[PDB]
Every structure is written in structure tokens, then in C-alpha cells.
């Protein structure tokens, strides 16, 4: 499938707990970079925001190549932070959380053609005031779309062909606005699917550091290595989920 060969955008954001949470999120950048350098992937420092003791509030990035997306699609969800952190004077085990979104490429096929047939323009004199010329000759060149039903009006000035150019620029601007609004609502819906409420609820992956083990909810593994994941070499967490996802 060509959807598996696409690049990805990783969005690692902080959930509960601030910095303790931020540090956990920051490590994950190190996790997937050590995971990524074992294969030869490009990490894009597209977006980041710092935390008080290290670790990040919201980080957004591009990873390009040949086949980044499936792993990202699998990951989207929550991550537990169980640790004895550095920002503590009591020395207890505390929980925080982070959220990781995996977005596909969706390459921009923008600017469809204007299309003359589909939209009908009506030549009317126009409204306004002050000239002998104002009444006699038309200056309302309304552009009406056929497939969407939008009319652009630049009963604007002096003559009707500069008003045609103005009304076509308004058609192009309103097409671009109405398509990018749907895409930001289509990204937003996808973003919501990728990241829940951000709380300490279990979403498909945990991290248990004073125990030395990692539970996964779907296709869970009893690997207490955490260490392998920490400097790349996870394969063992991602592969059996793919194995019993290809069965469905």
C-alpha cells in the first residue's frame, strides 16, 4: 500500500504534571531519535517549546523518508510517566502523562482551476452614485458558482472588467478560505482522534520505571527492558501489533 510508504508528522505534547511530564516527553524525542538513527531517518526540528527542568510543553516535527507513517499511526495516544523525578524534594514515585499524535503526509493539491462554464456572471449596471456614466452602462458583474452556489459582487467601480478581475480574485480567495477551513477542521478532527483529553487515563501504552517493565494495552508485551526502548531498538514493541493488525 502507498499509505504505508508515506512520511509523517510527530506531535509530542505535555499532559498532566508540567515539567515532570515535560521531561518524560523530552526523553521520547530521544527514544524515537535513537529508534530513527538505527534505520537512517531524518528528524525535523520544526517545532518546539521548552520546560523548566528540561523537557517540553508541546513539540511538533517532520520525519521524511520512505515509510515513516505506520509506526506514527500506531503510536497516537497517551504515555504514562511513573518515576522518581528530579524536581522533587520528597523522593516518591509520581505519575504524569504525555500525548503523541502521528499525522500522515496529505500532500497539498491546492488551487483548482477557476472554470468559466460552471459559474455564470451577470452584467448589470450596478448601484452607487454621482455620474452620468454611472447609470447608463453596467458595472455589476456578479459571479455565481454552479457547484457551490456562491455569488461574488464587485458592483465595484469605473467599468465591469476590472470588476471581473476583482470578482475572480474574491472567488479564488473564498475557495482557498473554504477549503483550508475544512482542512483545519479535517486536521482538527484527526488531531482529536490522535489525542484524547490528556489526563492520566490508559491509552494503549504505559511506562513503569521503578518496576523495570512496560505494559501495552493492545498487543501488550512483558518486556521489562525499557532500556532497549530508551536507546532505540524497540522493534519488539511495534512489530507484534503490526502482526495482529494485518490479521484484521
Amino acid at each position: 500500500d502507498p499509505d504505508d510508504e508515506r512520511n509523517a508528522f510527530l506531535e509530542v505534547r505535555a499532559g498532566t504534571g508540567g515539567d515532570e511530564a515535560a521531561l518524560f516527553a523530552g526523553d521520547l524525542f530521544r527514544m524515537y531519535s535513537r529508534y530513527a538513527e538505527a534505520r537512517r531517518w531524518r528528524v525535523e526540528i520544526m517545532s518546539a517549546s521548552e520546560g523548566e527542568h528540561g523537557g517540553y510543553k508541546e513539540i511538533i516535527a517532520k520525519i521524511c523518508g520512505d515509510g515513516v507513517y505506520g509506526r506514527l499511526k500506531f503510536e497516537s495516544g497517551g504515555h504514562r510517566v511513573q518515576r522518581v523525578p528530579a524536581t522533587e524534594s520528597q523522593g516518591r514515585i509520581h505519575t504524569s502523562a504525555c500525548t503523541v499524535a502521528v499525522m500522515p503526509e496529505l500532500p497539498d493539491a491546492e488551487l483548482p482551476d477557476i472554470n468559466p462554464a460552471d459559474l455564470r456572471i451577470d452584467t448589470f449596471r450596478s448601484s452607487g452614485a454621482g455620474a452620468q456614466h454611472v447609470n447608463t452602462t453596467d458595472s455589476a458583474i456578479r459571479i455565481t458558482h454552479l457547484p457551490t452556489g456562491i455569488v461574488v459582487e464587485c458592483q465595484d467601480e469605473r467599468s465591469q472588467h476590472k470588476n471581473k478581475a476583482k470578482a475572480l480574485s474574491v472567488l479564488g480567495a473564498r475557495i482557498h478560505a473554504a477549503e483550508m477551513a475544512k482542512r483545519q477542521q479535517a486536521e482538527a478532527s484527526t488531531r482529536r482522534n490522535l489525542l484524547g483529553s490528556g489526563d492520566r487515563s490508559d491509552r494503549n501504552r504505559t511506562y513503569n520505571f521503578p518496576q523495570g517493565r512496560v505494559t501495552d494495552h493492545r498487543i501488550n508485551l512483558t518486556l521489562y527492558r525499557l532500556d532497549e526502548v530508551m536507546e532505540g531498538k524497540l522493534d519488539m514493541l511495534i512489530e507484534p501489533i503490526i502482526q495482529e493488525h494485518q490479521a484484521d
Partner: protein, 123 residues
């Protein structure tokens, strides 16, 4: 004390309101039951509590907690609503009756089967 003031103004017993505003003391109601979603509780709990906003048959908009393990609800399937608070969700003071109307009972339960509508194991 001061019994002459009790002669003037009579000693009034407090009329405590009911814990469930259920329209003149009913055991159960039957509502439209939309909006099935999970809710984060108050402080010492941390769970995904399944809840439903039940538009009742008398106009009241109550929200009842969905108990048990697994359900067949999607924006429809009118069910039965019983009283009783949950002490877990601020605003939820009702429960859902399993074994009642179109929501079936909980799958594979053996103990405590008068609640949650599970029949007797026939074997």
C-alpha cells in the same frame, strides 16, 4: 425557649428536598438516553466512567451512570433509569437498569446477578 414567640410564630419542621428530583416520588423512569461518553471522576478515582445524558419522558434532563462491563448503546435504545447517587461524578445521581429494556445484560456474569440483569446459569 421563649414560648410566647412559639405562640406567635409556630415551630416549623424543615422540609428537606429529595436526593432525586423524580417527579412526585417514582422508583423508575424511562428516557431517550442520548450522549454516551466517558467521564473523568473526582479526585481519588482515575477511571473512564461510562455515562449517558438521559432525556426523560417528563422533560427532565438527567445523566445516569452506566454500570457493568460492556454495553450496546449508541445515541438511541431507550432504557430504564433508577435512582441512587454514585459519589463519583458531580451531577450524576442515577443508575441504569440492566436486564430491562433494549440494553441487554452484562455478558458472562455469575455472582450478584439480581443486579445487572444476568439470568441464572442454566448448566
Amino acid at each position: 425557649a421563649t414560648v410566647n414567640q412559639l405562640v406567635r410564630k409556630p415551630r416549623a419542621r424543615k422540609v428537606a428536598k429529595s436526593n432525586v428530583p423524580a417527579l412526585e416520588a417514582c422508583p423508575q423512569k424511562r428516557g431517550v438516553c442520548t450522549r454516551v461518553y466517558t467521564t473523568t471522576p473526582k479526585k481519588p478515582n482515575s477511571a473512564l466512567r461510562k455515562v449517558c445524558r438521559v432525556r426523560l419522558t417528563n422533560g427532565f434532563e438527567v445523566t445516569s451512570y452506566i454500570g457493568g462491563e460492556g454495553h450496546n448503546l449508541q445515541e438511541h435504545s431507550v432504557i430504564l433509569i433508577r435512582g441512587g447517587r454514585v459519589k463519583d461524578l458531580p451531577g450524576v445521581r442515577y443508575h441504569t437498569v440492566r436486564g430491562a429494556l433494549d440494553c441487554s445484560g452484562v455478558k458472562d456474569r455469575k455472582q450478584a446477578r439480581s443486579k445487572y440483569g444476568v439470568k441464572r446459569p442454566k448448566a
